[PDB]
Design a protein around this ligand. Structure first.
Ligand SMILES: COC(=O)C[C@@H](NC(=O)[C@@H](NC(=O)[C@@H](/N=C1/NCC(=O)N2CC[C@@H](C)[C@H]2C(=O)N[C@@H](CC[S@@](C)=O)C(=O)N[C@H]1C(C)(C)C)C(C)(C)C)[C@@H](C)c1ccccc1)c1nccs1
Ligand SMILES: [Cl-]
Ligand SMILES: [Zn+2]
Length: 253
């Protein structure tokens, strides 16, 4: 593996690693309370034997630049972070894969960047959502305070999240957990669009998902393909991420 640095539109440095391979170039986008280490820890990276893999730390996570403001964590800024990675490696075609809010980011990159040939959204759909301002602000307060890592650990543990997902929370600065949560009130509620007719768009979730309706709506509206994994909830579906990587490798082959 090699490390890289690029700069987002707003000057934020975005750091990541490149795992060379002769195959398709795949760009991995983690979720809010994660960093780039989840790709190896989940077994997703091992599932792609041939791909050239690019894995970034989003702004404010891991080795990337600090942000510490709500608007700095707007969805459009994450999109700019990913597009900067696409620039650095200079390809005409990329396949994007994102977990949870990372999936929403990957879909939005696909909407605006014609270099995205495929986008996979793991446990996030593409539809408009109603975000309660009160509840999100309350969650921001819970996660940014001294008890914030414990709050996330206890909740993810109680909902059956894999250990790597529980453990990743404690690697995120509490201030960036709060800012990223508030950032959701700056654009993340809108639906995503199809970028080009030839794009391959895939949504993945638990067959037990209590709200599959918006995933079906992406099938109809975007022509997306819906993949299911055996799990009673979205969070527990994260235990199947390596298996999903094997299915991605089949598509890339
Ligand atoms: C059934 O499974 C779930 O719905 C939980 C699942 N969340 C989601 O999929 C989506 N969000 C939501 O649905 C909803 N958001 C929420 N808070 C914003 C937010 O998300 N977070 C803030 C903190 C961060 C870790 C992340 C998160 O994770 N919060 C859990 C709670 C974690 S704790 C303790 O266990 C969460 O959801 N809190 C809700 C409420 C506060 C409204 C109760 C709405 C308002 C967007 C509808 C995310 C992907 C999203 C989609 C579209 C637009 C914006 C966000 C998880 N993803 C990762 C780990 S759990
Ligand atoms: Cl997330
Ligand atoms: Zn801590």
């Amino acid at each position: 593996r090699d490390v890289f640095e690029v700069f987002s539109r707003d000057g934020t440095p975005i750091r990541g690693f490149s795992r060379p391979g002769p195959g398709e170039t795949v760009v991995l986008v983690h979720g809010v309370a994660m960093d780039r280490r989840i790709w190896a820890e989940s077994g997703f990276l091992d599932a792609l034997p041939d791909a050239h893999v690019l894995a970034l730390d989003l702004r404010g996570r891991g080795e990337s630049g600090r942000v510490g403001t709500a608007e700095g964590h707007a969805l459009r800024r994450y999109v700019e972070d990913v597009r900067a990675v696409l620039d650095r490696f200079g390809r005409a075609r990329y396949s994007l894969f994102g977990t949870f809010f990372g999936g929403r980011i990957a879909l939005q990159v696909a909407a605006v960047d014609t270099r995205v040939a495929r986008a996979f959204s793991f446990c996030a759909h593409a539809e408009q959502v109603e975000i309660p301002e009160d509840a999100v602000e309350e969650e921001a307060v819970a996660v940014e305070g001294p008890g914030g890592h414990a709050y996330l650990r206890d909740h993810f543990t109680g909902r059956g999240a894999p250990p790597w997902m529980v453990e990743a929370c404690a690697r995120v600065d509490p201030g960036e957990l709060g800012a990223a949560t508030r950032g959701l009130l700056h654009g993340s509620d809108r639906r995503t669009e199809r970028g080009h007719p030839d794009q391959e768009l895939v949504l993945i979730t638990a067959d037990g998902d209590a709200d599959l309706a918006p995933f079906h709506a992406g099938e109809r509206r975007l022509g997306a393909h819906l993949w299911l994994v055996d799990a009673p909830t979205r969070i527990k579906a994260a235990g199947r991420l390596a298996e999903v990587g094997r299915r991605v490798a089949g598509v890339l082959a």
